[PDB]
Structures are given as C-alpha cells and as structure tokens.
Design an enzyme around this catalytic site. Structure first.
Site, PDB file in Angstrom:
ATOM      1  N   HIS A  12       0.795  -1.217   0.000  1.00 53.55           N
ATOM      2  CA  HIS A  12       0.000   0.000   0.000  1.00 53.55           C
ATOM      3  C   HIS A  12       0.833   1.276   0.000  1.00 53.55           C
ATOM      4  O   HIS A  12       1.464   1.605   1.011  1.00 53.55           O
ATOM      5  CB  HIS A  12      -0.900   0.065   1.234  1.00 53.55           C
ATOM      6  CG  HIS A  12      -1.609  -1.200   1.548  1.00 53.55           C
ATOM      7  ND1 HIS A  12      -2.767  -1.575   0.905  1.00 53.55           N
ATOM      8  CD2 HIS A  12      -1.393  -2.134   2.504  1.00 53.55           C
ATOM      9  CE1 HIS A  12      -3.221  -2.700   1.425  1.00 53.55           C
ATOM     10  NE2 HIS A  12      -2.403  -3.063   2.399  1.00 53.55           N
ATOM     11  N   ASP A  67       2.965  -7.654   0.509  1.00 47.82           N
ATOM     12  CA  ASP A  67       1.977  -7.451   1.559  1.00 47.82           C
ATOM     13  C   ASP A  67       0.687  -8.038   1.002  1.00 47.82           C
ATOM     14  O   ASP A  67      -0.073  -7.363   0.312  1.00 47.82           O
ATOM     15  CB  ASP A  67       1.859  -5.976   1.905  1.00 47.82           C
ATOM     16  CG  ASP A  67       0.809  -5.682   2.962  1.00 47.82           C
ATOM     17  OD1 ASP A  67       0.005  -6.558   3.294  1.00 47.82           O
ATOM     18  OD2 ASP A  67       0.781  -4.533   3.460  1.00 47.82           O
ATOM     19  N   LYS A 108       5.770  -6.337  14.974  1.00 53.84           N
ATOM     20  CA  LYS A 108       4.816  -6.130  13.888  1.00 53.84           C
ATOM     21  C   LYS A 108       3.440  -6.539  14.383  1.00 53.84           C
ATOM     22  O   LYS A 108       2.647  -5.676  14.772  1.00 53.84           O
ATOM     23  CB  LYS A 108       5.215  -6.888  12.618  1.00 53.84           C
ATOM     24  CG  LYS A 108       4.613  -6.315  11.314  1.00 53.84           C
ATOM     25  CD  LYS A 108       3.133  -6.675  11.175  1.00 53.84           C
ATOM     26  CE  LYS A 108       2.439  -6.029   9.970  1.00 53.84           C
ATOM     27  NZ  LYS A 108       1.172  -6.738   9.655  1.00 53.84           N
ATOM     28  N   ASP A 116       1.410  -3.129  15.040  1.00 52.98           N
ATOM     29  CA  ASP A 116       0.630  -2.790  13.842  1.00 52.98           C
ATOM     30  C   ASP A 116      -0.747  -3.466  13.805  1.00 52.98           C
ATOM     31  O   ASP A 116      -1.786  -2.795  13.770  1.00 52.98           O
ATOM     32  CB  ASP A 116       1.468  -3.193  12.631  1.00 52.98           C
ATOM     33  CG  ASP A 116       0.726  -3.125  11.306  1.00 52.98           C
ATOM     34  OD1 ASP A 116      -0.474  -3.519  11.172  1.00 52.98           O
ATOM     35  OD2 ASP A 116       1.430  -2.775  10.335  1.00 52.98           O
ATOM     36  N   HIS A 151      -7.315  -8.507   4.837  1.00 50.26           N
ATOM     37  CA  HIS A 151      -6.532  -8.109   3.677  1.00 50.26           C
ATOM     38  C   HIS A 151      -7.334  -8.134   2.378  1.00 50.26           C
ATOM     39  O   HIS A 151      -7.140  -7.262   1.523  1.00 50.26           O
ATOM     40  CB  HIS A 151      -5.305  -8.985   3.519  1.00 50.26           C
ATOM     41  CG  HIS A 151      -4.455  -8.587   2.343  1.00 50.26           C
ATOM     42  ND1 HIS A 151      -3.534  -7.562   2.399  1.00 50.26           N
ATOM     43  CD2 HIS A 151      -4.431  -9.042   1.061  1.00 50.26           C
ATOM     44  CE1 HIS A 151      -2.947  -7.436   1.218  1.00 50.26           C
ATOM     45  NE2 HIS A 151      -3.469  -8.328   0.394  1.00 50.26           N
ATOM     46  N   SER A 179       6.706  -1.660  11.908  1.00 47.58           N
ATOM     47  CA  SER A 179       6.499  -2.660  10.873  1.00 47.58           C
ATOM     48  C   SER A 179       7.594  -2.557   9.822  1.00 47.58           C
ATOM     49  O   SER A 179       8.179  -3.558   9.397  1.00 47.58           O
ATOM     50  CB  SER A 179       5.127  -2.446  10.229  1.00 47.58           C
ATOM     51  OG  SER A 179       4.094  -2.578  11.206  1.00 47.58           O
TER      52      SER A 179
HETATM   53  N1  NAD Z   1      -6.065  -3.500   7.432  1.00 44.65           N
HETATM   54  C1  NAD Z   1      -4.912  -3.546   8.077  1.00 44.65           C
HETATM   55  O1  NAD Z   1      -4.246  -2.547   8.312  1.00 44.65           O
HETATM   56  C2  NAD Z   1      -4.420  -4.895   8.531  1.00 44.65           C
HETATM   57  C3  NAD Z   1      -3.404  -5.066   9.457  1.00 44.65           C
HETATM   58  C4  NAD Z   1      -2.942  -6.331   9.729  1.00 44.65           C
HETATM   59  C5  NAD Z   1      -3.547  -7.417   9.141  1.00 44.65           C
HETATM   60  N2  NAD Z   1      -4.622  -7.269   8.346  1.00 44.65           N
HETATM   61  C6  NAD Z   1      -5.395  -8.450   7.869  1.00 44.65           C
HETATM   62  O2  NAD Z   1      -6.349  -8.769   8.853  1.00 44.65           O
HETATM   63  C7  NAD Z   1      -6.700 -10.162   8.766  1.00 44.65           C
HETATM   64  C8  NAD Z   1      -6.609 -10.738  10.152  1.00 44.65           C
HETATM   65  O3  NAD Z   1      -5.236 -10.647  10.556  1.00 44.65           O
HETATM   66  P1  NAD Z   1      -4.807 -11.147  11.995  1.00 44.65           P
HETATM   67  O4  NAD Z   1      -3.352 -10.935  12.179  1.00 44.65           O
HETATM   68  O5  NAD Z   1      -5.737 -10.591  13.006  1.00 44.65           O
HETATM   69  O6  NAD Z   1      -5.083 -12.704  11.885  1.00 44.65           O
HETATM   70  P2  NAD Z   1      -5.175 -13.754  13.072  1.00 44.65           P
HETATM   71  O7  NAD Z   1      -5.015 -15.127  12.531  1.00 44.65           O
HETATM   72  O8  NAD Z   1      -4.263 -13.304  14.151  1.00 44.65           O
HETATM   73  O9  NAD Z   1      -6.672 -13.552  13.569  1.00 44.65           O
HETATM   74  C9  NAD Z   1      -7.785 -13.857  12.715  1.00 44.65           C
HETATM   75  C10 NAD Z   1      -8.835 -14.555  13.540  1.00 44.65           C
HETATM   76  O10 NAD Z   1      -9.980 -14.889  12.724  1.00 44.65           O
HETATM   77  C11 NAD Z   1     -10.619 -15.980  13.332  1.00 44.65           C
HETATM   78  N3  NAD Z   1     -11.523 -16.566  12.352  1.00 44.65           N
HETATM   79  C12 NAD Z   1     -11.171 -17.287  11.244  1.00 44.65           C
HETATM   80  N4  NAD Z   1     -12.194 -17.676  10.534  1.00 44.65           N
HETATM   81  C13 NAD Z   1     -13.292 -17.187  11.220  1.00 44.65           C
HETATM   82  C14 NAD Z   1     -14.672 -17.269  10.974  1.00 44.65           C
HETATM   83  N5  NAD Z   1     -15.197 -17.894   9.926  1.00 44.65           N
HETATM   84  N6  NAD Z   1     -15.500 -16.669  11.856  1.00 44.65           N
HETATM   85  C15 NAD Z   1     -14.965 -16.040  12.907  1.00 44.65           C
HETATM   86  N7  NAD Z   1     -13.688 -15.897  13.237  1.00 44.65           N
HETATM   87  C16 NAD Z   1     -12.892 -16.501  12.344  1.00 44.65           C
HETATM   88  C17 NAD Z   1      -9.469 -16.886  13.738  1.00 44.65           C
HETATM   89  O11 NAD Z   1      -9.824 -17.855  14.694  1.00 44.65           O
HETATM   90  C18 NAD Z   1      -8.413 -15.874  14.207  1.00 44.65           C
HETATM   91  O12 NAD Z   1      -8.325 -15.695  15.613  1.00 44.65           O
HETATM   92  C19 NAD Z   1      -5.717 -10.749   7.753  1.00 44.65           C
HETATM   93  O13 NAD Z   1      -6.308 -10.692   6.467  1.00 44.65           O
HETATM   94  C20 NAD Z   1      -4.581  -9.732   7.850  1.00 44.65           C
HETATM   95  O14 NAD Z   1      -3.681  -9.802   6.760  1.00 44.65           O
HETATM   96  C21 NAD Z   1      -5.024  -6.015   7.998  1.00 44.65           C
HETATM   97  N1  XI6 Z   2      -0.610   3.506   6.651  1.00 42.92           N
HETATM   98  C1  XI6 Z   2      -0.146   2.328   6.129  1.00 42.92           C
HETATM   99  N2  XI6 Z   2       0.815   2.381   5.151  1.00 42.92           N
HETATM  100  C2  XI6 Z   2       1.311   1.242   4.625  1.00 42.92           C
HETATM  101  C3  XI6 Z   2       0.905  -0.033   4.947  1.00 42.92           C
HETATM  102  C4  XI6 Z   2      -0.069  -0.144   5.946  1.00 42.92           C
HETATM  103  C5  XI6 Z   2      -0.614   1.029   6.547  1.00 42.92           C
HETATM  104  N3  XI6 Z   2      -1.581   0.684   7.448  1.00 42.92           N
HETATM  105  C6  XI6 Z   2      -1.635  -0.679   7.466  1.00 42.92           C
HETATM  106  N4  XI6 Z   2      -0.703  -1.248   6.559  1.00 42.92           N
HETATM  107  C7  XI6 Z   2      -0.536  -2.767   6.310  1.00 42.92           C
HETATM  108  C8  XI6 Z   2      -1.696  -3.399   5.575  1.00 42.92           C
HETATM  109  C9  XI6 Z   2      -2.242  -4.445   6.464  1.00 42.92           C
HETATM  110  C10 XI6 Z   2      -2.856  -5.635   5.644  1.00 42.92           C
HETATM  111  O1  XI6 Z   2      -2.476  -5.707   4.277  1.00 42.92           O
HETATM  112  C11 XI6 Z   2      -1.061  -4.836   7.572  1.00 42.92           C
HETATM  113  O2  XI6 Z   2      -0.344  -5.951   7.344  1.00 42.92           O
HETATM  114  C12 XI6 Z   2      -0.166  -3.485   7.671  1.00 42.92           C
HETATM  115  O3  XI6 Z   2       1.162  -3.784   7.847  1.00 42.92           O
END
Ligand code: NAD
Ligand code: XI6
Ligand code: NAD
Ligand code: XI6
Lengths: 427, 427
Positions: free
Chosen positions: A51, A128, A183, A187, A298, A356
C-alpha cells in the site's frame, strides 16, 4: 516517464507530509543514520507490492538511502495515497499506483515492477498480501531463479506462503515480517485500534456510542478493533471459530456470538478473519436499515459482495455506497469490501508503521546479504532484532528502559543486552 | 494421623466452598466426567507442591477421581487456605500445609510428600515454583530414578527448569504448564487483574483512585496488575528491562520509568518481575510515609526484605506490617514480601484456576502414560489440548463458537476441528 500516478502535481503536499512522518518514524531514521554510508543494499533491486501511503514513502526512501533501487506498486486498488505516490515519482523512483484502480490496472501496476528499463529485473520482493509473490511464482518463473527471497508484511500473505511451502510450491526464501513481535503485536493491534475507527468515521460519520458493533475474528486485528469501538461506548460483540481467542474475548467482557444468530441486532459489522464469506447474502438481507458493513482483513472476499450485484447500488461518496434491497431497506458498504482503514481513511499512523517497516528493511538487508544461508521455507528474524526494533521507538514516546545488574541477568538466565525472552514467549 | 493442618474442624466450611468452586471450574468437572470411570491415573503416586487453596482442593480431588493417590504440600508459607487443607485432610488425603508456616516447617511439609506409609514413594511431581523439583534432584536422587516427570505451574519454576537443563542437571521429563496459552494468557494475566487488587484491599483498604502506582515488570502478571489499578483510577507507572514489553506498556498509555528516578513519587509499588532485588533499601528509604509495598511474583526476593531487619517492625494485622525508618517515616509491607494475592487474599478465583489446573491434570495423564516417549528436557502440551482446555470453559460464560465450513477451513489451511493456529502464534 517511468512512473504512473494520478496527479504528479500533488508531490509538494506529499513531500510535506513525508517530512512530518519522518519525525514520527524513528526506527526508519535510525536505520538511515546507521546504514546510509555503508549502503548495505547497494546492488539490491527490490520489487515492492505494498500500500503506497505516506508511510510507505518513508520506507521506500529508507531502502533507497541504504543503496537499493526499487520499483513499487500498491497491494490494493484503494489504498494508495496519491500525494505520496507523486512525491516518490517526483524523486525519480518508479512507482505505479493510484487510488481507485481497476483490477486490470492493479495487475498491470504489479507487472511494471518486474521489468525496468535497461533490462532491470528484481533480485528481491517486498510483499503485503502475497500477490506479487504469486505473480512471480506462477507467471515469471525465469525471474524466480534470480530472486534471493521475499519479505512478507501480513497474516494473509503468510498463510499463502505456508500453503505454498506445504505443497513444495515455495521456490525462494521468505521472511515472515508479520510475526515479528514488533509487527503483529503492534501494527495489527494498535494500528487497527486507531485506523478502523478513522475509516468508519470518514466514510459515514456514524456515532459509535450506544451502537451494537460486531467484530468477526478476535486475532490481533479483531482485538484492536474491539478495543477501538468499546472505548467509544459501543456494545461490542465478537465472533470466533478458535476456542482460545473466544475465551480471551469473553474474559474481556465481550459476548461471543454467531452472526447467524445476531444478524438483525447489529448496527456495525467488521470482518477481521482473513477468511472467506464470513458475511453472506442472508446475513445482509437480515440486517437493519442503514446497517454499516465493512472489512478490515486483507482481501474483500471476507464479504460475499458478488451476492449484491443483484440489487441496485447508489453511490453516496467515493468508497461509500448504498445497496438497496427489494423491500427498500439499505445497507452501507464501505470501499466495496476492501480494507476500510486504507480504503476510507489512511491506514495506520506513521509511528506504528515505523515498527512494521523497520522490520521490513532489516529483512531486506538479511536476504540480500545472507540469502544463501536460507532454504526455500518461511523464516522469522531473530529476537535480538525484534528487540532492536522496539528499542529504536522508545525514545520517541519517552519510555525509559531499566538496566539489569549482572546478578539480575544471571538470576533469570539472560544476557544483559538481550535477548530477554525465550523464543516461544508470547508477549 | 497422616496429615497436618491448622484446625481440622474447618473441614465443613472448606467443603462448602469446594462445592461452590466446582460450579466455577467446568474444565476440571468435564475431565472427571470424561475420565473418572476409565481411571487413567490409577497407579499414579503424585507428590504435589502447590498453594493449598480452595482451588487446589478441586484439583486434588480431580486427580483422585481419575485414580491417582497424592501427597500434598503448599509452595508458599502464607498461601494455604486452612479450611481447604482441612477439607482435603478430612477426606483422608495426606496434605501438610497451613497458613503461617516457618521456613523449617515449609521444608518439612514438602519432605512429607516424598515418603508415605507402607513405602509409598511418588512416581510423579506437580510443582509450582520449582522447590519440590529442587529437593528431589538435590537431596533424594534415588527417588529421581522412579519419577516419570514433573508438571510445573509458573514462570519462575519454568526458568529454573531451563537453568537445570542448560547445565545437564535436569534428570526427568518436565511439562511446562505455565506456557499453555490457557495458562499464561489467562491465569497470569486475568487472575492477577483481580487478585492483586483483592490482596491490596484486604490488607490496607487503600483507595486506588488518584494514587500513583508503579508496577515493576510488564509480562503477563505485570500486564494484569496494570490494568487492574488503571481500571480503578490510579495513575499507573511501569518499569521494564525488555524493550518490547516496555513499548507495549507505552502504547497502552503507561509512562515507562525507573524506580531509581521515581521512588519518591509512588504511593504503591508492585513487584512482578520474577527477578532479584528490583526494590532495594535506598528505594524504600526514599519512599513517602505510608507508601505501600508488595510483591506478586513467585518469590519474596524481588524485594530486599533483609535490608529492613535493621529497623523496628510494628505489626498492624496478620501479613500487614509497618517498618519504621529512623526519621519516623513508615512503609507498609504486605506479607513480608511474599505473593500478596495469596498471602493477603485468596489468590485467583476458581474460574481461571480451572483453566490452569485442567492443563495440570492433562499434563499428569500424559506423563504417567507416555513418559517413556520423552527425554530429560522441557516440553509443552500440544495445541489441540490447549484448545480443548478453552473449549471446556466456553459454556460456563455463555460464549458461542462459530463453526467453519469446509471451504473456510481450506481457505486458511486448518482442520475444522483444529488446531486453528500455527505453533508460534502468540494470541
Ligand atoms: N487492514 C490492516 O491494516 C491490517 C493489518 C494487519 C492485518 N490485516 C489483515 O487482517 C486479517 C486478520 O489478521 P490477523 O493478524 O488478526 O489474523 P489472526 O489469525 O491473528 O486472527 C484472525 C482470527 O480470525 C478468526 N476466524 C477465522 N475464521 C473465522 C470465521 N469464519 N469466523 C470467525 N472468526 C474466524 C481466527 O480464529 C483468528 O483468531 C488478515 O487478512 C490480515 O492480513 C489487515
Ligand atoms: N498507513 C499504512 N501504510 C502502509 C501499509 C499499511 C498502513 N496501514 C496498514 N498497513 C498494512 C496493511 C495491512 C494488511 O495488508 C497490515 O499488514 C499493515 O502492515
Ligand atoms: N501470584 C500469582 O498468582 C502469580 C501468577 C503467575 C505468575 N506469578 C509469578 O510472577 C512473576 C512474573 O511472571 P510472568 O509470567 O509475568 O513473567 P514474564 O517473564 O512473562 O514477565 C516478567 C517481566 O519482568 C521484566 N523484568 C525482569 N527483570 C526486571 C527488572 N529488573 N526490572 C523491571 N522489569 C524486569 C521482564 O522483562 C518481563 O517482561 C514470576 O515469578 C511468576 O512465577 C505469580
Ligand atoms: N487461588 C489459587 N489457588 C492455587 C494456585 C494459585 C491460585 N492463584 C494463583 N495460583 C498460582 C500461583 C502463581 C505463582 O506461584 C501462578 O503460577 C498460579 O498458577
């Protein structure tokens, strides 16, 4: 010519925010101070798919300042910050990314990082979500042989690496950066505890207090989302398939429920599972009028958005939409199911992205330098580097570390300078 | 005759609280339901050294109901609940434990579990803090050969196992129960989040709101202590030697400071480090009048209590003392530096001890049955049993688990019935 961004004239704004962000990202500046002269990434040719935010700008320029040459794309069609992309392009760095890409354009942008002028090819990948890793393995296998390894940012991309390796499909070393402690435990958790709220607000301006909010999944991301909405006065519900994570949520006073049971009662739904169709058509049909629905994992496949092409879609503003059901009831869908913090806001703030991204840089130095010491499996960085990452961020926020005496180091069996915990410690 | 408790007439009260506690410890009752007929511990002779509370009563009787014979002592001179000890002794179970032991008596009580009538010797040890493990290894090495293994409750005892194993001193298998997820992440944390507060209150009745409280160490125990006092309106300070744990505390809004700097500013000090003399003479001399000082880690050596024999000690009530400094200023020391939750209150509540103790029983079944499959090292129980422990506690608190569809199980690469996380997941 060797870039593609929405409006190059946004570069001065992007640069102004990059300047503030440096003061917020001490890990990345400390690595420039340590390494910019010795240029340990000189000769590194990094293809990046991550991103393109203001934060990723400071990452890219850190890589460059250590000697690397990079070609960058975003890993999501809505996550780019255009003024960040511009600032990078203006510096002469090849970046291919803008907010609001189509799927075709998205994949074109990725491909642009695999080939540069003068026969530029990457010897490293920074990923990512695993898309760049998949493209290279599945469509450019001659490139694979010159790749020293990939460093991977997020839980979903790590799942995909593990799937590949189980079936003998992983053909390069991979460093799992998500599961650095500095991380995953910062994060994923404290990032989303701020940026989930930010996207919801920018998109809908909804009052959190008094609302019934349901978080699907209570991993690192779900845990941060829950705390975020609880702090603002929401009744927070949690769904989980893991009994341990379910118990954690109950012991924090969240009711643990299924969306099957509660679909009619929720005001806000956040998917945080990294899984597939945890929100189905019948769930949304059951939802109250103006129920707000978003995904923070994600990929957008957490929600069956396809099941809604049936109905009419009325746009409210960019990345905020109504879908009208036959009986006239409406739900609000954020960023068509793409991650809402980066889609409707700016993602995590710079301070936590520095943690991160300091891991990312270190992962890239380790692969460039010592990839031959690694096999075609998934690794994590050692704990002393994890601890280093945290050390570099303590000064910014006024935290003063206590120093062990010799006898205290011996009493618990550690060196005074670390590592301070066994490998299996969970923090 | 084969017991030693303060007043056997307390057995009916102890029994009445054991009865309530069973309704709070579904993990232990589920294991009786599963296993009491098949008696998988028949032939097990367990020497136990673990705080003899109402909760440990339900543990002991669970072991017995699965076929075991036990001999029990407490692992702390103040932690016993006399009415619990009595209830067990009245059942004909050898227990040697009472609140207020001397050091000589403490060690006599341990020794009593190593030898029973008719040449009873243990083939298993159940330990909390490592004292029983040390006695056997260092003073009864002929017994060592008939020991199948030890299961160990707490962080300090695990440190001591690791120290032994590093130098070739570990001569039996050991199961680290502390680092079950359903132990460390629940007992250490949510246990202390309730029982730290309980001991402080019973001992001193001090107002938490508005006080400056300093927690030394921000591991699992320190994290729970911090949240406990923050919930009640204390300004909470944290000291740490680990940069990662320090950063966690800062990101939760705790100032991270040294006791060297802040000794004059604190109203309450809680040691939670598992380390040695983190509170020294000069720290306490610097403390304000009526400053309250306590330790929650396993051993009282977190505080240099020896440095206070110099001064006069005026008792307030059992386990609450004043020590008067030459200038007349006084500090309040709880339980002479012994763990305050068990010393001045009752330790953790039954519900969370059920999680801890369900792991213990499973560890004992695994060692009795399959110890030959193990070497003289430290092991943890597999994740599917960790998950089982959590499952058994969900019903009590109304948590409803979501069930994965086949396609969701495949999408994240798990079996529908678990384990749901990789081995290195940190929850
Ligand atoms: N948007 C962002 O900035 C950001 C940041 C980090 C990660 N992510 C994404 O967030 C998602 C979750 O990451 P995470 O590190 O929390 O994963 P994680 O594995 O630590 O936690 C995910 C949880 O989902 C639960 N789960 C799975 N299937 C399920 C279902 N059907 N119903 C209910 N619960 C269910 C699991 O038991 C688990 O505890 C991933 O796609 C990750 O890449 C996004
Ligand atoms: N401001 C920012 N800049 C760049 C990347 C960033 C972000 N905020 C969350 N991200 C990632 C995306 C998620 C899932 O793809 C996480 O893994 C995290 O590491
Ligand atoms: N009383 C109870 O009911 C109970 C429950 C569980 C554990 N314990 C005991 O609590 C203690 C801590 O257990 P834990 O699981 O939290 O351990 P832990 O290792 O998870 O955390 C202890 C922390 O202390 C920090 N530390 C070490 N030396 C320090 C120093 N000199 N100054 C400041 N910080 C320092 C470490 O960096 C670490 O984060 C152990 O003795 C454990 O056995 C007691
Ligand atoms: N009510 C109670 N009964 C029995 C044991 C208890 C307890 N409350 C905390 N404990 C242990 C002691 C600590 C340190 O020795 C932890 O390891 C914890 O597992």
């Amino acid at each position: 010519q060797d870039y593609k961004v929405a409006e190059i004239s946004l570069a001065d704004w992007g640069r102004k925010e990059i300047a503030i962000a440096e003061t917020e990202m001490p890990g990345l500046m400390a690595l420039r101070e340590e390494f910019s002269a010795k240029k340990p990434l000189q000769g590194a040719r990094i293809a990046g798919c991550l991103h393109m935010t203001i934060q990723t700008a400071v990452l890219i320029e850190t890589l460059v300042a250590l000697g690397a040459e990079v070609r960058w794309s975003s890993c999501n069609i809505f996550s780019t910050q255009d003024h960040a992309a511009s600032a990078i392009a203006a510096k002469g760095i090849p970046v291919f990314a803008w907010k609001g890409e189509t799927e075709e354009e998205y994949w074109w942008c990725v491909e642009q990082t695999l080939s540069g002028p003068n026969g530029w090819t990457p010897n490293l990948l920074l990923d990512d979500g695993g898309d760049l890793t998949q493209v290279v393995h599945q469509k450019h296998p001659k490139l694979l042989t010159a790749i020293k390894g990939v460093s991977e940012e997020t839980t979903t991309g790590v799942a995909r690496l593990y799937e590949m390796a189980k079936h003998g499909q992983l053909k390069i070393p991979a460093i799992n950066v998500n599961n650095a402690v500095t991380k995953s435990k910062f994060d994923n958790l404290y990032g989303c505890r701020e940026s989930l709220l930010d996207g919801l607000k920018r998109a809908t301006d909804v009052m959190i207090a008094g609302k019934v909010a349901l978080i699907l999944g209570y991993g690192d991301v779900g845990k941060g989302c829950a705390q975020a909405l609880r702090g603002q006065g929401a009744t927070v519900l949690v769904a989980e398939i893991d009994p341990i994570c379910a118990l954690q949520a109950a012991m924090e006073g969240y009711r643990v429920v299924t969306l099957d049971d509660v679909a009619e009662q929720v005001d806000i739904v956040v998917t945080a599972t990294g899984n597939y169709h945890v929100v189905t058509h019948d769930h949304m049909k059951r939802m109250r009028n103006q129920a707000i629905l978003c995904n923070i994992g994600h990929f957008d496949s957490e929600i069956d958005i396809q099941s809604l092409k049936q109905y009419q879609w009325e746009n409210i503003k960019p990345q905020v939409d109504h879908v009208i059901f036959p009986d006239g009831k409406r739900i609000i869908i954020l960023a068509e199911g793409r991650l809402v913090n980066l889609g409707c806001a700016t993602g995590h703030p710079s301070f936590v992205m520095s943690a991160s991204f300091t891991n990312q840089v270190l992962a890239q130095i380790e692969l460039f330098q010592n990839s031959s010491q690694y096999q075609n499996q998934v690794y994590v960085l050692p704990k002393v580097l994890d601890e280093k990452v945290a050390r570099l961020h303590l000064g910014r926020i006024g935290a003063k570390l206590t120093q062990l005496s010799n006898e205290q180091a011996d009493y618990i069996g550690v060196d005074k300078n670390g590592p301070y915990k066994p490998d299996h410690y969970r923090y």
